[PDB]
């Protein structure tokens, strides 16, 4: 940076703090991950000036011809990357490109049927505090209580009771592959649309490394800042047949003008992931979250699922008589960043949990290896089985650094 | 840019484009500006990475400590520039903005009274094609047939017949000072909120150009991209009493995680708008377009409502016997960026129209003076009365490279 410490001194400090807070800290955030330079060269560039309401070669303001191509690119490697028939690549977010959706197959107050949100499911699959819930109907569906698997029979009797007009499948907190195949024959049972949000493991499908929602949706939704590892933002794919319908959710229905600056990130993120480099990055991903998963097992830990299938797990920390809460607090302490998490059938609030989330998309865009994997399950181990030791703190706060550098 | 060039040469090269095309075309849209490089670079940033759903000391995600710096000097900022009791800088963009207001006071076909859409309201001040016309019922006020100010005995009556549970007011193309004060006034008749949308106005509102709605509106919207020169995206204003309901409103309610690079951005932005030279910037914006109005109407151009008090004009094109669609084509063809706008009492179509729309921002922010104004006037009348002359066209052309360089 060159202007912004001297315009700015007070933002400049903020950010220089962040930046080494990025690269200190052991980053299990399930959602987060960290973006290229070219990603946010796009991002920090002149395309913010421009107003391009509407779509390439059909915007509602004149000297669109470069942010068109721009848009084009985002939307044509997209759909090389998913296999997908149109893409949207306008929304703002994850919550924005699910209210689309929603906008354009639902009226108010119409039944919607989604993951239970205490077993993986999405505040914006149908909390009562978020728009979703709010403006439509919604059910859900649940996990086994054993297995912690998506019970199907669950998904079709609760379809087939409640006669939904969309399904939603997909999660923020589910470690095993979902069976989208599944979903639609249920979906085609009860007259449904399906939807599927893949946000947390889109890079994954990109990879070949979970199933493609693609040819089993009528909808698919996505963030492209997880394990897409692109700026932040949101993006829908659909069938041709959808694709004017979507377009005129997305805008006039509900944004203005899109931010063309964060599309370049996008274009930028999706010409990454069509690289050979990415999906060996991707299977990392999958290969840590594995590794570090046994090796919590390893520590005494019991996972939800029994293990995971993706980039994420969940650990139940009943059996360490410990909340989520309490976890996430001590880890804090010594730089390893976690969310608490409800787990299934979780006897505690949301406010308090029963267990924490941990994904390895960040930590293996960094570079840690199966090695680093072991290592932070020994050294969560030592914390979470120590809360009470300052000693072990300080010793876990050095085997963080070490790890770092 | 290091990095972008090498990694995508596709992506770089149309951004390259866009860079150039900025600065040889005379960018006359209204809702356009030139952001800093600080404000990009901000942009440009690392703080893309961090998820921190939640406020300031209030998040749902640990580490954010410096994220909250930033938003709070954002906030801060913003509460400095117009005087507000509490500010929101989550919103991803000026449609979301108007959203959150709108999902805070109003439920599912309530009544709301917005501006005319063809009279100079915006597409979220109730079209059927966006969500605000699809969800509330919105009805409108007009502008006197003859003046083209806001008839505010027609404010009044649509209130006290329809009794809306929201007034709404502002305008994405009204050239005139906003009487704030008596739209305060009806809304307390008929016992509604009011909501005022500056977005247009911010930062001559900033620069106390414009009288401020801060003190009468129970919330003020307002995009960071227009008058007030920052990134695009939204933010909302309040009175404490509504903090709580408003913030809750953009999350959990229509957003999840914010752009916290582009906040970075807005609290430079407010930096910005804070200093001395700013205000000398939006005086010189203001004085430009009455410049530019004063020089058109020498050529022999009608304005609607007879001039501007504002950053912004519309011309009537009936006269010359030209749609907004033709005079738009045309000067697009010499480097002139004007938009086709609707104009009060418009008999054509809004695809079609009988005006265009022109503001002064951004050519003021590239250093543009009264000088340029008349030239910029000339231009506009060798083309707009002389369409068939190709010779005249490459005059103009010619014209319009010696303005930009
Ligand atoms: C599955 C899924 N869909 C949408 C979103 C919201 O995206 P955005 O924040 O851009 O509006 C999410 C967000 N996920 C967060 C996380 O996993 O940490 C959190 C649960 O909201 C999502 O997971
Ligand atoms: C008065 C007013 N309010 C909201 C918006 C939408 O903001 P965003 O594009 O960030 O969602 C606008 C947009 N204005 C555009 C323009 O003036 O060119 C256009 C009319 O939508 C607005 O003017």
Do not use: R, V
């Given at each position: 940076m060159k202007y912004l410490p001297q315009q700015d001194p007070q933002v400049f400090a903020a950010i220089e703090q962040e930046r080494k807070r990025q690269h200190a800290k052991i980053e299990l955030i399930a959602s987060e991950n960290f973006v290229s330079r070219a990603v946010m060269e796009a991002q920090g560039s002149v395309l913010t000036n421009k107003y391009a309401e509407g779509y390439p070669g059909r915007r509602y303001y004149g000297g669109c011809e470069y942010v068109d191509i721009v848009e084009e690119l985002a939307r044509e490697r997209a759909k090389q990357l998913f296999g997908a028939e149109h893409a949207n690549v306008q929304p703002h977010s994850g919550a924005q490109a699910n209210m689309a959706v929603y906008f354009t197959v639902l009226e108010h107050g119409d039944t919607v049927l989604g993951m239970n949100l205490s077993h993986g499911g999405h505040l914006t699959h149908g909390s009562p505090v978020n728009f979703s819930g709010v403006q439509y109907n919604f059910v859900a569906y649940g996990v086994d209580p054993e297995t912690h698997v998506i019970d199907y029979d669950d998904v079709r009797e609760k379809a087939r009771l409640h006669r939904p007009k969309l399904i939603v499948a997909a999660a923020s907190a589910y470690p095993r592959i979902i069976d989208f195949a599944k979903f639609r024959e249920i979906a085609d049972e009860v007259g449904a649309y399906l939807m599927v949000d893949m946000?947390?493991?889109a890079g994954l499908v990109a990879a070949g490394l979970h199933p493609n929602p693609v040819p089993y949706a009528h909808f698919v939704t996505t963030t492209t800042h997880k394990t897409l590892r692109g700026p932040r933002?949101?993006?829908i794919l659909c069938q041709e047949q959808f694709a004017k319908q979507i377009d005129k959710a997305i805008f006039p229905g509900?944004?203005?003008g899109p931010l063309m600056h964060v599309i370049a990130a996008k274009a930028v993120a999706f010409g990454e992931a069509?690289?050979?480099?990415?999906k060996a990055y991707a299977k990392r991903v999958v290969d840590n979250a594995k590794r570090?998963?046994?090796?919590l097992q390893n520590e005494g830990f019991t996972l939800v699922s029994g293990g995971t299938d993706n980039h994420l797990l969940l650990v139940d920390l009943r059996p360490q008589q410990l909340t989520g809460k309490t976890a996430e607090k001590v880890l804090d302490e010594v730089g390893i960043t976690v969310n608490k998490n409800?787990?299934?059938?979780?006897?505690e609030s949301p406010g308090v949990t029963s267990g924490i989330r941990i994904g390895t998309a960040a930590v293996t865009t960094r570079g840690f290896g199966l090695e680093?994997?072991?290592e932070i399950a020994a050294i969560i181990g030592l914390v979470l089985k120590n809360v009470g030791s300052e000693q072990a703190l300080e010793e876990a706060r050095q085997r963080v650094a070490a790890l770092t550098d």
């Open positions: 946000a947390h493991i933002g949101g993006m509900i944004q203005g069509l690289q050979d480099d990415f570090l998963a046994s090796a409800t787990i299934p059938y979780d006897p680093e994997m072991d």
